[PDB]
A paper describes a structure:
The apelin receptor belongs to the G protein-coupled receptor (GPCR) superfamily, comprising nearly 800 transmembrane proteins that provide targets for over a third of all FDA-approved medicines. The receptor binds two endogenous peptide ligands, apelin and Elabela/Toddler (ELA), proteolytically cleaved from preproproteins to yield smaller, active fragments such as [Pyr1]apelin-13 and ELA-11. Dysregulation of apelin receptor signalling can, therefore, contribute to a range of disease states, and there is much interest in the apelin receptor as a therapeutic target in cardiovascular, metabolic, immune, renal, and neurological conditions.
To further understand the potential implications of the orthosteric variants for small molecule agonist binding, we determined the crystal structure of the apelin receptor in complex with CMF-019. The structure was determined by molecular replacement using the previous apelin receptor crystal structure in complex with AMG305431 as a search model and refined against a dataset including reflections up to ~2.6 Å resolution. Residual electron density maps revealed the pose of CMF-019 in the orthosteric pocket, and that of an oleic acid molecule wrapped around TM4 and protruding into the orthosteric pocket via the large opening between TM3, TM4, and TM5. Our structure showed that the elongated CMF-019 molecule binds in a semi-vertical pose extending from the upper part of the large orthosteric pocket, where it lies at the interface between TM6, TM7, TM4, and ECL2, reaching the bottom of the orthosteric pocket at the interface between TM6, TM7, TM2, and TM3. As a relatively hydrophobic compound (Chrom logD 3.14), CMF-019 makes mostly Van der Waals contacts with the receptor. The binding pocket is also lined by several polar residues from TM3, TM4, ECL2, and TM5, notably including the tyrosine residues Y185ECL2 and Y2646.51 that form hydrogen-bonds with the CMF-019 carboxylic group in the extracellular vestibule (ECV) and core amine, respectively. Whilst it corresponds to the monoolein molecule observed in the previously reported AMG3054 and cmpd644 apelin receptor crystal structures, in our structure it protrudes somewhat deeper towards the agonist, and lines the CMF-019 binding site between sub-pocket II and the ECV. Its carboxylic head group stacks onto the CMF-019 aromatic core and forms a salt bridge with R1684.64, which makes a direct contact with an outer edge of the CMF-019 central aromatic ring.
Residue numbers in the entry: 29 to 55, 62 to 134, 140 to 228, 1001 to 1048, 1053 to 1106, 235 to 324
Amino acid sequence: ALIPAIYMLVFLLGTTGNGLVLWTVFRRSADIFIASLAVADLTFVVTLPLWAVYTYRDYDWPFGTFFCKLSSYLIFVAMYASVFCLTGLSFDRYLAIVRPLRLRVSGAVATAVLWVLAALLAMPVMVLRTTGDLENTNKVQCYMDYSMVATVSSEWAWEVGLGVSSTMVGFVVPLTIMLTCYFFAAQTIADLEDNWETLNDNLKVIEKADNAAQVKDALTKMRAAALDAQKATPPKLPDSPEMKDFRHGFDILVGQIDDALKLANEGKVKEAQAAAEQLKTTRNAYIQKYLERIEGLRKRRRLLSIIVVLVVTFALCWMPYHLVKTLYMLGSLLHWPCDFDLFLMNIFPYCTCIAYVNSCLNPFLYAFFDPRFRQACTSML
Ligand SMILES: CCC(CC)n1c(Cc2cccs2)nc2cc(C(=O)N[C@H](CC(=O)O)CC(C)C)ccc21
Ligand SMILES: CCCCCCCC/C=C\CCCCCCCC(=O)O
């Protein structure tokens, strides 16, 4: 009685939200993944009224064996396709941070592959799903029959075999790829920011310093950070007109640090602090804006943020489903008490709601991070 309501709520939110996303993308490099996610999320929730009616009828499937096989199959392919599309979107956001449109062709290929690979991994569910009176309650259930692939003493090896494969490909491998993407990109972004943090932190140190040696020490660390940010090539590729302007901006800053460094060496603390404060002028403020703009700093921070929200929304939504399926896999295999077997069984339909929550949450995360979808939806509003 509780679960059917949630299944209905996610059905409306899922098809209206992801329906609005497809309307927009059909009215960039990572835009293949967006439209694939919209159509995977859309097929994922589309047969839920069948399972909402099934759960309401105290687990009694009235729609026959073909709708039991087809409904489960469409859900299971959407299940993998949307995970693989989230992982492909997280990998495309990773490349937009490291590398500098051939990706428009490549993304289409990647999406095509994961769409076939998903429709093939979901094939065992299309095969073993069947309807019959399981555990004799007089109501027919839509269950996965492992008896058509093994004897009584072997149904576990199939249940575990397919179950472990489902979690490995549907959770462990994509989360391992999305975490690797985060760890590499976060490192790269935290390289540019480290040099700019060092510059600002040490300027505060010069302002409050009490002697020339303290001012000299902070200037030395600022000078090494300025040259460190000059060596890191921005997202532009020899001695081109635009390339010289980047290095000249840094040369002004390094020169001003050297000017204060020579005053510090002569023991002129007040004059060195005043010389250091030249970096705060409007002239040097636009040099900072030009150089931080040339590096694509705020634009790469937004890109890293996109990865984190994908990784986390996914880890939070799918962990309960994958933890309880893996725990139940072991409860039946290495036998656990019926107190714990029956717990995992009854908490499992709640795990499918929190996992479904990912599908209808996505249209809002696109609306958050992409102001082009915000402007495409607000024009139609
Ligand atoms: C296709 C139907 C949907 C439900 C709408 N469904 C999904 C995909 C999703 C739909 C919505 C969110 S996830 N996965 C499922 C996994 C099982 C399952 O493994 N049951 C185990 C016994 C067995 O092996 O048959 C026992 C539990 C206690 C572990 C059952 C239904 C599953
Ligand atoms: C050519 C066929 C492809 C080979 C498949 C190998 C990978 C199998 C992995 C997942 C298949 C789905 C298994 C689902 C686990 C049981 C969940 C359920 O009760 O529906």
